[PDB]
């Protein structure tokens, strides 16, 4: 129960606040120091981290469903949840596996171009329609974010394009689910996370992750603590992510999640008065203008 006018601001604030700590703790865990010198045994089990995060999110979603928003049948077909989960997992795998093949568009275009495919896919598969103003706003936002994040044969770059396409397919599936089957945010989150948990669990049964991460954690129990908190930091952060997509759509969710980093950096610079580069002023101005035109005069 929230006012409609103060709905989008709530989602934006929630995601922005949650994912900042999410990233901080992800860095603290993945980087790690553990042993000393050669004993370091740097953390390399990313898939196990994603699996733990997925199971934690599923548990939190089940808690939310049982304690609140009860008496509501799902009405959604399971195969749709499975399709969304496979698309999400494939996109994440491809994105994580493209780091060591791309240098210039290394997350500059892999991310900051998240909306376009989704939007385009929505136009093609679901035959949706948006005003030309929306196209211009999305393009301006993407260009501004990409130009702001810039930091001082093309064979392997296909992986990033495949990741973007899979993300677009996931957005299309989510839009179809919410439009036709009236699936709730919590139900969608729980089912998608359960399917992803099953897939990842099947994946990590190979000795590389499970029977190695277990022993490694036994060596350094402290990590567990951080891990747990990280999981929580995802849950809340994921909740809003799976709420806005239901209330305003995958396109709005993608715009929020792709401009969150730029907003956070701008706010941190303003608070610290850091001397942002003169070029990046162009990117922030473009993003601001695109958002303004999206909100009004072409919404």
């Amino acid at each position, epitope marked *: 129960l929230v006012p409609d006018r103060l709905r989008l601001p709530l989602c934006f604030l929630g995601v922005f606040v949650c994912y900042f700590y999410y990233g901080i703790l992800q860095a603290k865990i993945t980087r790690g120091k553990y042993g000393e010198g050669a004993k370091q045994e740097t953390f390399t089990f990313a898939l196990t981290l994603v699996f733990i995060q997925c199971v934690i999110n599923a548990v939190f979603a089940k808690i939310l469903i049982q304690f609140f928003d009860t*008496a509501r*049948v799902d*009405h959604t077909r399971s195969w749709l949840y499975a399709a969304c989960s496979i698309s999400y997992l494939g996109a994440m795998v491809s994105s994580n596996s493209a780091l060591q093949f791309v240098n210039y568009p290394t997350q500059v275009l892999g991310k900051s171009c998240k909306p376009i495919p989704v939007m385009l896919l929505g136009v093609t598969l679901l035959k949706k329609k948006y005003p030309l103003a929306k196209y211009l706003c999305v393009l301006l936002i993407v260009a501004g974010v990409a130009l702001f994040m810039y930091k001082p044969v093309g064979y392997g770059e296909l992986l990033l394009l495949l990741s973007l396409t899979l993300d677009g397919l996931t957005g299309v599936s989510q839009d179809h689910m*919410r*439009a*036709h*089957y*009236q699936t709730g945010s919590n139900h969608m989150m729980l089912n998608i996370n359960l399917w992803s948990t099953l897939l990842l669990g099947m994946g990590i049964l190979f000795t590389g992750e499970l029977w190695e991460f277990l022993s490694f954690a036994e060596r350094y129990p402290a990590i567990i603590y951080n891990i747990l908190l990280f999981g929580l930091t995802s849950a809340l952060g994921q909740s809003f992510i799976f709420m806005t997509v239901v*209330y305003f*759509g995958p396109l709005t969710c993608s715009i929020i999640t792709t401009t969150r980093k730029f907003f956070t950096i701008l706010a941190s610079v303003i608070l610290f008065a850091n001397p942002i580069s003169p070029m990046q002023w162009v990117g922030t101005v473009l993003v601001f203008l695109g958002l303004g035109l999206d909100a009004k005069f072409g919404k």
Partner: single-chain antibody
Amino acid sequence: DIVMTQSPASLTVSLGQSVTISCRASENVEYYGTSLMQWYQQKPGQPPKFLIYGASNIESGVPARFSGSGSGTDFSLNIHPVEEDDIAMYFCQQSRKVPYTFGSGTKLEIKGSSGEVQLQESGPGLVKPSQSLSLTCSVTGYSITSDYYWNWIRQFPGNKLEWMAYIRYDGTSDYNPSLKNRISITRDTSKNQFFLKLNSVATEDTATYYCARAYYYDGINFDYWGQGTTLTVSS
């Protein structure tokens, strides 16, 4: 609960004319840009026939004459080239909230006057007040353990429909909150049947009970219907 109102109680039209039936809801029935609205057609002495879902999507097999329009709390059903076939009562149903409600129904009249699923209901025709009643709907040509909702509906004298409850193939059941305390829906997969039990039936309960099969898509759509069983409560 949402109250559906059909403005024209009965329309007198000639052959070939265009007819528009208006249905209004007490609350917005849109859920993320989609209108959870359904239109059914019921010929005399026959179960209602599913026509439209989503307020604009014509059900497969329905003639192209029928068309739906509207949004928000106002909807309309249009049949431009009307013929003698489309002479019946037209009902508007909302699937926005759990207590699915049907409109009062609009009567349309002319001047001058193993390859499918089969449902069959059984039960006593006459029951004394305050007794317990149990109706059975038997399904043939299909299994009630497959992906389809199995609903119980009742039509009172005057053609005022009312959705009692339903049981999904998963075993999950939903009830009308008004009747949740009085009725109980169960199933028996071994015999491929499902039963509705009512406790302390009153004189008001007199009605014709149908058991229907529905699939959820832009709202619940009672696509297949049984033949209906009459129930009379008298002293």
